[PDB]
Design an enzyme around this catalytic site. Structure first.
Site, PDB file in Angstrom:
ATOM      1  N   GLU A  35      29.463 -80.577  -8.465  1.00 54.44           N
ATOM      2  CA  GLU A  35      29.385 -79.174  -8.797  1.00 54.44           C
ATOM      3  C   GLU A  35      27.958 -78.656  -8.840  1.00 54.44           C
ATOM      4  OE1 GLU A  35      31.705 -77.031  -8.764  1.00 54.44           O
ATOM      5  OE2 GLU A  35      33.523 -78.208  -8.995  1.00 54.44           O
ATOM      6  N   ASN A  46      30.326 -65.732  -6.162  1.00 58.26           N
ATOM      7  CA  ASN A  46      31.362 -65.770  -5.140  1.00 58.26           C
ATOM      8  C   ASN A  46      31.626 -64.359  -4.686  1.00 58.26           C
ATOM      9  OD1 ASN A  46      31.986 -68.682  -5.410  1.00 58.26           O
ATOM     10  ND2 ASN A  46      32.639 -68.052  -7.468  1.00 58.26           N
ATOM     11  N   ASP A  49      35.351 -62.840  -4.254  1.00 56.27           N
ATOM     12  CA  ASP A  49      36.194 -62.353  -5.356  1.00 56.27           C
ATOM     13  C   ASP A  49      35.419 -61.799  -6.542  1.00 56.27           C
ATOM     14  OD1 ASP A  49      35.535 -64.580  -6.886  1.00 56.27           O
ATOM     15  OD2 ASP A  49      37.614 -64.999  -7.471  1.00 56.27           O
ATOM     16  N   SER A  51      33.507 -63.155  -8.660  1.00 51.01           N
ATOM     17  CA  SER A  51      33.329 -64.029  -9.800  1.00 51.01           C
ATOM     18  C   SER A  51      32.058 -64.840  -9.644  1.00 51.01           C
ATOM     19  CB  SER A  51      34.539 -64.950  -9.976  1.00 51.01           C
ATOM     20  OG  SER A  51      34.635 -65.906  -8.938  1.00 51.01           O
ATOM     21  N   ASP A  53      30.260 -68.806 -10.829  1.00 48.64           N
ATOM     22  CA  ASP A  53      30.404 -70.115 -11.407  1.00 48.64           C
ATOM     23  C   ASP A  53      29.129 -70.439 -12.201  1.00 48.64           C
ATOM     24  OD1 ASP A  53      32.927 -70.581  -9.995  1.00 48.64           O
ATOM     25  OD2 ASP A  53      31.751 -70.999  -8.229  1.00 48.64           O
ATOM     26  N   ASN A  60      34.213 -71.045 -13.856  1.00 47.34           N
ATOM     27  CA  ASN A  60      34.365 -69.740 -13.199  1.00 47.34           C
ATOM     28  C   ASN A  60      34.687 -68.642 -14.191  1.00 47.34           C
ATOM     29  OD1 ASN A  60      36.296 -67.621 -11.488  1.00 47.34           O
ATOM     30  ND2 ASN A  60      34.625 -68.439 -10.244  1.00 47.34           N
TER      31      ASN A  60
END
Ligand SMILES: [Cl-]
Ligand SMILES: [Cl-]
Ligand SMILES: [Cl-]
Length: 130
Positions: A35, A46, A49, A51, A53, A60
Site C-alpha cells: 500500500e 482517486n 471517484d 476519494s 487513500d 479510503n
C-alpha cells in the site's frame, strides 16, 4: 514517518494485530509494504471517484474516515482522515481492525489480493522477533 520493516512488525504486534480476525502479522506487513512502502504520511487521490487513500494502509475516505471532501461518504472508523497521517499508527490500526470486521476482511484492499493472497509472505517478518 517511513518505518523500517522489523520496527513496524513489532509495532503492529504490540497493537494487537497478530492474528486479528484470523490475519497473521505477515499479512498486515505485506499489506503495508504494498500500500505505502511503510509510509504513514502517504496520500493518493482517486480522481475517478473523488476519494482519497490515507496513510500506511491507504485507508479510503469513501467508507472509513472523514475528509469532508468525498461526496456521499461515510466514516465507519469515526476518525478524521488526518488521524491516519500520524507517525503514531494506533488510530490507523484501530481503523484497519474496523475494516476487517466487515465480511471481506483483508480482501477489502485490492493490493492484498494482488501482492499477498496465496503467496509465501514469511519474508516480511523474518528476523523481527515477532
Ligand atoms: Cl496466511
Ligand atoms: Cl480524529
Ligand atoms: Cl504522530
Amino acid at each position: 514517518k517511513v518505518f523500517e520493516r522489523c520496527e513496524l512488525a513489532r509495532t503492529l504486534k504490540r497493537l494487537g494485530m497478530d492474528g486479528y480476525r484470523g490475519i497473521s502479522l505477515a499479512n498486515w506487513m505485506c499489506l503495508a509494504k504494498w500500500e505505502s512502502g511503510y509510509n504513514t504520511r502517504a496520500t493518493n487521490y482517486n480522481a475517478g471517484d473523488r476519494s482519497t487513500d490515507y496513510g500506511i494502509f491507504q485507508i479510503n475516505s469513501r467508507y472509513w474516515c472523514n475528509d469532508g471532501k468525498t461526496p456521499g461518504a461515510v466514516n465507519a472508523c469515526h476518525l478524521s482522515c488526518s488521524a491516519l497521517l500520524q507517525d503514531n499508527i494506533a488510530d490507523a490500526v484501530a481503523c484497519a481492525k474496523r475494516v476487517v470486521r466487515d465480511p471481506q476482511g483483508i480482501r477489502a484492499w485490492v493490493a492484498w489480493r494482488n501482492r499477498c493472497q496465496n503467496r509465501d509472505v514469511r519474508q516480511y517478518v523474518q528476523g523481527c522477533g515477532v
